[PDB]
Amino acid sequence: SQIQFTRHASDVLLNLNRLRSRDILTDVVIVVSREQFRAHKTVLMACSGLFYSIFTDQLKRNLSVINLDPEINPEGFNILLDFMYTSRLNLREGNIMAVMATAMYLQMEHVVDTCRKFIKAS
Amino acid sequence: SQIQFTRHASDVLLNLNRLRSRDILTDVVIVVSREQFRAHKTVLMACSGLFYSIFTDQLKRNLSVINLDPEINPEGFNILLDFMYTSRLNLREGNIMAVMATAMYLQMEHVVDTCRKFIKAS
Ligand SMILES: COc1ccc(CNc2nc3c(ccn3CC(=O)Nc3ccncc3Cl)c(=O)[nH]2)c(OC)c1
Ligand SMILES: COc1ccc(CNc2nc3c(ccn3CC(=O)Nc3ccncc3Cl)c(=O)[nH]2)c(OC)c1
């Protein structure tokens, strides 16, 4: 019976992305080969099975640096990080395989399924 | 030209609320008279002009406790905190004034405007 604010969640996410852009309250650096990306652990956990599994463990909860698998493409990771914070996925025929493999590694099942649909439709 | 995931933002918010429910990565306690509420500063900043103005200031960025104005009703605050994390506002004729006044204090203009519409429609 509560009143629904249909833009609230999108507004929240946009504002979280603004905070990331200003490095406000970011609490982890994700290192991917020669590149690094700062983020909020909460958003990573909300969007990725890998990050959820890492930070839910009290043993790893306070890590400030995560080194991703050396074989992960920083491009693929960047695309997915921007998706996490925007709901918009930049899939193209020139990056689909990198994005899909990265999404498998990050355990983002719905994104992987969408990548498969992209392949089917191309 | 990016692919839009129309449920992603809502899913993120739901997951953030799940993290709050488990006290995972919460980083502030909001004290409101005799009650206390834990939350994520990022979500508070995303949803409230008061919290945004507080935590954007490097002087207050690292506060772990915020004591709200003693005149603020903990009920009104609780209702609004749950709105922040759910997009659903529990307005009723028995709580409208408390919620509205609290939303004014928290600088949640759209919620205040909605409270005014509620009054107009009642
Ligand atoms: C409810 O059963 C779960 C929960 C979690 C996992 C991990 N696998 C996974 N996780 C994903 C996605 C997409 C985002 N997430 C993160 C997420 O759901 N986070 C979250 C969940 C519950 N409460 C708070 C939070 Cl932050 C994904 O495709 N697979 C699971 O794997 C089988 C099952
Ligand atoms: C863009 O101009 C602004 C930004 C902020 C304020 C503070 N007044 C206010 N803030 C509100 C609501 C509802 C949620 N918020 C928080 C918010 O917008 N947070 C945010 C903004 C930009 N980047 C990152 C973040 Cl976290 C509200 O009704 N009034 C402003 O007041 C005039 C103007």
Helix orientation angle between B96-106 and B74-86, rounded to the nearest 10 degrees: 70
Helix/strand/coil for B28:
strand
Sign of the Cα torsion B48, B53, B57, B63 reads: negative
Resolution (A): 1.3
**Contact (CB, 8 A) for A102 and A73:** yes
Residues in CB range of B50: below 8 A, 6 or more apart: B105, B106, B107
**Minimal CA–CA distance to B67: which of B105, B22, B96, B99?**
B105
* B60 DSSP assignment: T
**Contact (CB, 8 A) for A13 and B85:** no
* Method of structure determination: X-ray
Tokens standing for A35?
A: 């590149």
Q: Is A47 in the pocket of ligand 1 (CB under 6 A)?
A: yes
Is B83–A6 a contact, with Cβ atoms under 8 angstroms apart?
no
Q: Which chain B residues are closer than 8 Å to A1 by Cβ?
A: 90
B53 touches chain A (CB under 8 A): no
Q: What is the C-alpha separation between A64 and A17, in angstroms, rounded?
A: 19
Q: List the domain range (segments joined by +) for residue B22.
A: 1-122
Residues in CB range of B42: below 8 A, 6 or more apart: A16, A19, A24, A25, A40, A42
The count of structural domains within chain A is 1
Q: What is the C-alpha separation between B51 and B61, in angstroms, rounded?
A: 10
Separation of CA B22 and ligand 1 centre (Å): 14
What are the start-end ranges of the H helices in A6-108? 8-21, 41-47, 49-56, 74-86, 96-106
